[PDB]
Structure formats: structure tokens, C-alpha cells
Amino acid sequence: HMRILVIAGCSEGFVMPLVPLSWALRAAGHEVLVAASENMGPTVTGAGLPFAPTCPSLDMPEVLSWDREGNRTTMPREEKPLLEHIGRGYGRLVLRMRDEALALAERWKPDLVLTETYSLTGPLVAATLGIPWIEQSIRLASPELIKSAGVGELAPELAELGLTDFPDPLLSIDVCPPSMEPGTTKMRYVPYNGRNDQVPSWVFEERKQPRLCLTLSLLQALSQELPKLGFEVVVAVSDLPEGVLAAGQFPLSAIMPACDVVVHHGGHGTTLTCLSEGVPQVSVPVIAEVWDSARLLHAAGAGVEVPSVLAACARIRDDSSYVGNARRLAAEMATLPTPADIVRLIEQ
Amino acid sequence: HMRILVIAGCSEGFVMPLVPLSWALRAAGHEVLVAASENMGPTVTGAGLPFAPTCPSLDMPEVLSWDREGNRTTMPREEKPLLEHIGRGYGRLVLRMRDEALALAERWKPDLVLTETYSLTGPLVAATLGIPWIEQSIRLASPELIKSAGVGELAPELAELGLTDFPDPLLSIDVCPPSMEPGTTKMRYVPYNGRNDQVPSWVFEERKQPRLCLTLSLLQALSQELPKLGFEVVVAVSDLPEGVLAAGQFPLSAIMPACDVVVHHGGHGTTLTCLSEGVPQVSVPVIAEVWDSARLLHAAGAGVEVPSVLAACARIRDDSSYVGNARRLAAEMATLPTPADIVRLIEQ
């Protein structure tokens, strides 16, 4: 029997991927409390997990765009100093959270901290209370530059602890398929993208043609043009062109089996979801920390990275080497230790 | 890797207790779909699980109060024929669900059906597709009279399958503490009572006095009188007297540690939650199928069954043999195989 404080981020893409490990712990009789920004409350409880706020509502730009001196900052265009820029942001996110996260941990008294590799509030609280912590990667590829730049930014707070670095994690968990890439432990990625639900009709019925999921237009533009390549399009988003079948937020992990191509923003969760379900992807990456995962993906032949989108879909629609690679990777991930397996590791 | 269809009921008390086993399966890499009445949708998705409806919105009285001929029925006053009355109700609930549940299972193709002992739609669908099924008890005590009366009511549908009874479950799971009571397997009860959340302030802070949780008044009446026995009262319900601290729905399993007495309706989930947290209970039972669990509870000295409520609370407030027994039982349950343990059993 254990008490694990899960210290999460301020956006859904950084919270949801910790849900399956959190429930794996709870399923093994342990006590779990997920701590995150106030605005993540509904996401945490919507996953059926206990929630406690560590700071008022927040988004990353808020903290990425101003440095510790209160001076505005700007995006480096070169990739490397951009990675460090991002890292320092994640470091400053800690400053918004640590007070309430530490106070909470003193009242709740966890044996263990579970956290995401860029959620540095975890390692800090752990180091402060002198308890072990676990690190989970929620990305195909997580630049060490981001983490190290983040630790750097936290230099003063680590000095108050008489430290220059964070104590090592009990476990450091990785979800990247081996054939696609460190003191780490592999783990199978179990998708969690859900909020509400009703696995729509068509998902359980037949597919009479190639299906594609999309997740002054762009969204509306791709929605009209894409069916002309011979696709039936479903658009899984929150916010009626002829070739599109569906409109609204769908359980992405439950709708996945019902299609043959996914076009998306390059998000970490969506990427890993598609991989684990063996569905070829067209990734149009935006955020910089996802660049590395889209490259890995492109090289593996499981999808196309588009730094035109129509071209990639037609290419995949005709070249069967993409489904083949996607399914190969899915099958590879399926051999990895499940979250339930990892819990047994943790408890020893 | 497995595909498990979880076939649940039409009320929250019959759905929520299957959530931890369902997530234990998902944590072990398996695929899960919870099938229940339309009105259980939000409860299922609110637990972070995939949902599919097997019939329109429904409540038990609807189906308990009319027999198969369309004739109104009435409550027997004697306990035994009342048990059979209840059983036939659960049997007729199957008739509302089986069509959409079977159609769903044919499209989804499960390897396994997980269900609650009185949710007889499960065993039927399983028997129909020729696949194994698992039975979980969600009660301290589950009269065989209810189950058998239910199987009886389904005599015709089992004849279409060339059967007089349901094929035996792969596993038959039981959650009653041994010292408190069959081809069954013990399992530790992991509480799930949640919807939304924010483990309120006072739960993590100190308790300056004995705390009691309550879950033309009754609720308002007990709320005013109970503080006069020396209690600070919190009322965990959906729908300002001096001695009461809090007003609204709380994560019952997370608020539990913060109190010394619980007074409640005798529900199955609330009872097991209190037991597992070692908190003495005053049970004022209503529903008939919960009678057996309140008796078991009273005999074990872990709480008082009130078929006056103030008397029981003062009795517990002064007699330390109640906390002692409650904690003894909690400690006993804590030695039982977790839901994660049971999944390993299932997969062999």
C-alpha cells in the first residue's frame, strides 16, 4: 500500500498521458492524488481521478513569454536556442506551482511522486521532502536540451536544498518503440484521449471506403478538399461538406480502428495513439518540442511529416508501405511492458 | 491482449463498482468497452471509460413494477418472496438490454464479458456468443435467491440457446472480508464513488473534533440534531445549520479519512467504502437487497444497523470497539488480492 502524488502540467496533452499509469497504481490498491493547475481539474476528474489544484488557471504561453525578471521574451528561430527557451519556460512553470504543491505534499504525505519529464515541480517537491520520484516520458522523443535548460533555470531553488541537480528518479520510463530510436525502462503506451463518449455508430459498422480522420479555413479547407482524393472524412474536434461523415469530438482512441489515415497537428498523444493503433499518419507539426517525434516518425516510414498535405495523403493512400510500417510499430509497442507491469516494478 | 465487454446496470451504484476492475484491465493493455443504459453514459465516461448504450434511459422501479405480461406488481412484505420479486425484476431488465447488447457484441467481438452478479445481460450475451464471462460481486452479501429468481424469469430466453441455466463464470469474484461471512475468488474492494472533484481544504487540514459524514426534513433534520452530540457534520450529497461544516457532493472516498463516523442509507458502495477505510458506520437501510449487508455489518461490531439514529452515533462516539472493529476489517480487506492481481488471474 502506497501514497502517490501525481504532479502534472497545465495543458491536457501533458495531463492525460499520465492517466493510465495513475489508474494502474490505483488498480494495484495504491492511493493516488493528481495535482495540477486549477484549469486541469475537469480533465483529471473526467478521467475518474482525484484532483487538487497547485496554482490558478494557466496556459504555457503565459509563462513562456516572460522571464524571471518580468521581461518579455521572444522565440529563437534556430532550433537549439529555441529548445533552451522552451526549457526555461517549463522551469518557470515550477515557480507558479511549487508553493501549493509542496504544502499539499506536507499535508498529504506521499511516499512517491509520479510526474512527466518536463513537469519539474515533481522532482523538486520530492527532493524537498526526501522521497523517491518516478519519471514518465509522454513523447516519442524528449530533447535533453529542454530538461537541462529547465534544471538550469531552477538553479536558485535547488541551492536552497543544497543541490545543483535533481536527485535521480527511482524509475525513468520511456514509450518510444526500440526500433525507432538510457537508464530507462520501456513501457507500452496505453492511449487516453477521452472526456465524454459514445463510440458512434459507424465505428462499429462497416467501412465501404478509405477513411481519414483530421483532428479562411485550414480545418474547413482540408475538410472539403480531402474527400476528393477518395477519402470519407471524419473530423474529431471540439469546434457539412459532402465527403465528411461526422462532426464533433470523438473518443479518438476508440474511433481509431475505424480509419486508414490520420492527418493531425503533430501532438505527442495523437502521434503515440496512431502508432499504437497501427494507423499511418500525416503530421503537420506546429509546436517545436514535437519536431523530434515527427522526424522519428517520418524516418520509420509510418507516416509523412509536412513541415502539400493532400500530396501526403494520396501518397499514403497508394503506398501500402505506410500501413505496413505503422502496424509493425504498433505490434512492436504491444510487446512492451504494460502500465500494470511497471507498477510491479515500482513497488519493488 | 484481450477485448472485454463490461455489461453494467441502469443505476450508478451498479456501474461505479465495476470501474476499478475495468481500469485494471485497461492498465494491463486490454481493450475495454462499458455497455449500459443510456442514462449511465455520463457516469461511465466520467470514470474515464469508453461507453456504449444498450437501451434508452431507465430506472429499476420502471422494470420492477411491471411483469412480463404487462401486469402491475407489488412488494411482498415477507423477506423471502420479496427477494424473488427483486430477482425477477433484474431478469426483466435483461429483456430491455439484450438486443442492443448482443448486436454490439457481434460487431465489437469481445473475448470476454465482465459483469455484476445481478446484471444477467452479461451471462446471456456470453452464452449466446460462446465466450467466457466474469462475475463480480458489488455487495457484502448477495442472496442466491435474487440470482436464482432472475435466472428463472429468463427461462424462455435460455431455451432459445438450448440451456436451462447460464454457463459458469470463468471467475466469480467476492469482496466480503473472510472473517465476516463458494467457488469464488476474494478481491480487495477499491472504492470508486467519484464524479467531479477537488479534495476540499479541510480534508487535508486538522480535525479539532469528532467529525461525522451524512451522505419535513430527515437530511435537514439529522443535519441540525447531530452536531448536538458533539459532532462537526459534513453532508456529502448533491441537493447552513450551525454544526455542519460543508454542503455539496464530495469525493466520498477522498473525504473518508477526514472523519470518525458515517451515517448513511445502507448502500452497497458506501458500506464497502467505509469498511475499506476503517470508519464505523450508522446504516439506516432502505432497499431490501442491502438488508443482508447491514446485518453482517452489525454482527461484526463495525457499525450500527438502524432498521434512534442519534442513539447509534452517540453509542459509537463513546464505544471505541466500533472504530477498532472497522479498522480490523479494513486491515483484513487490505490483505486481499487487488484488482490488478485479479487481472493476472483472468489472463491465465
Side-chain angles (χ1 to χ4, degrees):
Chain A
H1 186 205
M2 258 180 292
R3 224 161 176 95
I4 309 93
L5 180 55
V6 189
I7 292 179
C10 65
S11 54
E12 265 166 52
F14 299 150
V15 174
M16 288 181 307
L18 291 172
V19 165
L21 183 52
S22 285
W23 258 112
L25 294 171
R26 204 166 173 196
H30 309 297
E31 194 165 340
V32 168
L33 181 58
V34 180
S37 65
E38 180 78 50
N39 60 293
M40 287 296 94
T43 297
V44 172
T45 70
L49 295 169
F51 173 77
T54 57
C55 70
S57 177
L58 251 195
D59 296 328
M60 273 303 314
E62 228 165 317
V63 352
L64 187 52
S65 297
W66 289 264
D67 64 27
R68 297 188 57 159
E69 311 252 52
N71 299 330
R72 187 129 198 184
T73 68
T74 57
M75 292 271 300
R77 192 59 192 176
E78 294 193 67
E79 164 156 338
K80 195 243 185 58
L82 180 55
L83 257 47
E84 294 166 330
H85 178 247
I86 286 173
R88 296 193 295 274
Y90 284 117
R92 295 195 288 275
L93 169 57
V94 178
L95 303 184
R96 307 289 284 278
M97 282 178 168
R98 68 191 191 105
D99 287 333
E100 277 304 306
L102 184 56
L104 177 61
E106 278 159 2
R107 282 181 168 84
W108 201 61
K109 285 163 282 182
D111 317 313
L112 208 40
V113 175
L114 162 63
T115 193
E116 173 261 316
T117 171
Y118 294 159
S119 294
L120 294 182
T121 301
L124 180 56
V125 177
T128 301
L129 300 185
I131 65 182
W133 66 285
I134 290 140
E135 180 187 59
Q136 187 191 314
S137 164
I138 57 166
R139 302 170 181 81
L140 273 182
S142 301
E144 73 185 335
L145 259 291
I146 296 182
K147 185 154 127 207
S148 60
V151 172
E153 186 78 342
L154 288 176
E157 282 70 31
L158 286 180
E160 305 181 355
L161 292 206
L163 300 158
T164 73
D165 198 331
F166 289 114
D168 284 24
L170 193 69
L171 269 191
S172 177
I173 305 171
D174 192 273
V175 291
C176 184
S179 80
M180 206 183 162
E181 66 196 344
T184 65
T185 311
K186 288 303 184 184
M187 188 203 282
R188 180 184 171 180
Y189 180 83
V190 173
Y192 180 72
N193 322 99
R195 173 169 76 109
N196 270 72
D197 212 287
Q198 169 163 335
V199 188
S201 170
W202 40 273
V203 182
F204 299 116
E205 247 300 302
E206 294 188 349
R207 324 208 297 245
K208 263 176 163 56
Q209 55 172 336
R211 188 162 316 173
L212 183 153
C213 169
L214 190 38
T215 47
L216 56 287
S217 27
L218 197 64
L219 184 72
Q220 307 170 284
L222 296 166
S223 291
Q224 299 195 13
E225 308 296 58
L226 273 162
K228 303 169 183 186
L229 280 60
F231 288 119
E232 177 194 23
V233 170
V234 302
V235 187
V237 294
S238 52
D239 52 15
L240 306 157
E242 199 89 359
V244 338
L245 181 73
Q249 189 61 260
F250 297 109
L252 200 52
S253 46
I255 182 190
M256 201 60 65
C259 55
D260 314 87
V261 196
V262 182
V263 180
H264 62 100
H265 61 286
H268 292 298
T270 310
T271 294
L272 286 156
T273 302
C274 292
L275 275 186
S276 92
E277 277 295 341
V279 179
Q281 338 178 19
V282 181
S283 175
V284 55
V286 202
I287 293 111
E289 64 180 296
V290 322
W291 283 351
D292 288 22
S293 55
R295 293 179 209 201
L296 264 49
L297 185 55
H298 188 69
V304 176
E305 179 203 26
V306 304
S308 185
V309 177
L310 289 209
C313 298
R315 200 171 167 195
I316 286 154
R317 185 206 63 208
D318 293 330
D319 189 342
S320 62
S321 70
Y322 286 95
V323 180
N325 270 309
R327 294 183 175 177
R328 171 179 58 76
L329 288 170
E332 180 181 4
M333 294 175 54
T335 66
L336 297 179
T338 70
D341 296 331
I342 290 305
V343 171
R344 291 177 225 119
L345 267 53
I346 287 172
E347 58 197 8
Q348 292 175 331
Chain B
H1 186 205
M2 258 180 292
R3 224 161 176 95
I4 309 93
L5 180 55
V6 189
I7 292 179
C10 65
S11 54
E12 265 166 52
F14 299 150
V15 174
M16 288 181 307
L18 291 172
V19 165
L21 183 52
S22 285
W23 258 112
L25 294 171
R26 204 166 173 196
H30 309 297
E31 194 165 340
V32 168
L33 181 58
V34 180
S37 65
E38 180 78 50
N39 60 293
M40 287 296 94
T43 297
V44 172
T45 70
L49 295 169
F51 173 77
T54 57
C55 70
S57 177
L58 251 195
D59 296 328
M60 273 303 314
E62 228 165 317
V63 352
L64 187 52
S65 297
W66 289 264
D67 64 27
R68 297 188 57 159
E69 311 252 52
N71 299 330
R72 187 129 198 184
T73 68
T74 58
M75 292 271 300
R77 192 59 192 176
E78 294 193 67
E79 164 156 338
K80 195 243 185 58
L82 180 55
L83 257 47
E84 294 166 330
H85 178 247
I86 286 173
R88 296 193 295 274
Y90 284 117
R92 295 195 288 275
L93 169 57
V94 178
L95 303 184
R96 307 289 284 278
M97 282 178 168
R98 68 191 191 105
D99 287 333
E100 277 304 306
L102 184 56
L104 177 62
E106 278 159 2
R107 282 181 168 84
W108 201 61
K109 285 163 282 182
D111 317 313
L112 208 40
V113 175
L114 162 63
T115 193
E116 173 261 316
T117 171
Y118 294 159
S119 294
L120 294 182
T121 301
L124 180 56
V125 177
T128 301
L129 300 185
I131 65 182
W133 66 285
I134 290 140
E135 180 187 59
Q136 187 191 314
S137 164
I138 57 166
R139 302 170 181 81
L140 273 182
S142 301
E144 73 185 335
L145 259 291
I146 296 182
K147 185 154 127 207
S148 60
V151 172
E153 186 78 342
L154 288 176
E157 282 70 31
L158 286 180
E160 305 181 355
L161 292 206
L163 300 158
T164 73
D165 198 331
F166 289 114
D168 284 24
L170 193 69
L171 269 191
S172 177
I173 305 171
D174 192 273
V175 291
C176 184
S179 80
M180 206 183 162
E181 66 196 344
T184 65
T185 311
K186 288 303 184 184
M187 188 203 282
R188 180 184 171 180
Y189 180 83
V190 173
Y192 180 72
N193 322 99
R195 173 169 76 109
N196 270 72
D197 212 287
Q198 169 163 335
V199 188
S201 170
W202 40 273
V203 182
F204 299 116
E205 247 300 302
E206 294 188 349
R207 324 208 297 245
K208 263 176 163 56
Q209 55 172 336
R211 188 162 316 173
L212 183 153
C213 169
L214 190 38
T215 47
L216 56 287
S217 27
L218 197 64
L219 184 72
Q220 307 170 284
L222 296 166
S223 291
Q224 299 195 13
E225 308 296 58
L226 273 162
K228 303 169 183 186
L229 280 60
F231 288 119
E232 177 194 23
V233 170
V234 302
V235 187
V237 294
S238 52
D239 52 15
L240 306 157
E242 199 89 359
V244 338
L245 181 73
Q249 189 61 260
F250 297 109
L252 200 52
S253 46
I255 182 190
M256 201 60 65
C259 55
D260 314 87
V261 196
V262 182
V263 180
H264 62 100
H265 61 286
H268 292 298
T270 310
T271 294
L272 286 156
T273 302
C274 292
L275 275 186
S276 92
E277 277 295 341
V279 179
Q281 338 178 19
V282 181
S283 175
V284 55
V286 202
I287 293 111
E289 64 180 296
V290 322
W291 283 351
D292 288 22
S293 55
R295 293 179 209 201
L296 264 49
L297 185 55
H298 188 69
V304 176
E305 179 203 26
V306 304
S308 185
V309 177
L310 289 209
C313 298
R315 200 171 167 195
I316 286 154
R317 185 206 63 208
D318 293 330
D319 189 342
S320 62
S321 70
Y322 286 95
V323 180
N325 270 309
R327 294 183 175 177
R328 171 179 58 76
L329 288 170
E332 180 181 4
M333 294 175 54
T335 66
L336 297 179
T338 70
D341 296 331
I342 290 305
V343 171
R344 291 177 225 119
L345 267 53
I346 287 172
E347 58 197 8
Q348 292 175 331

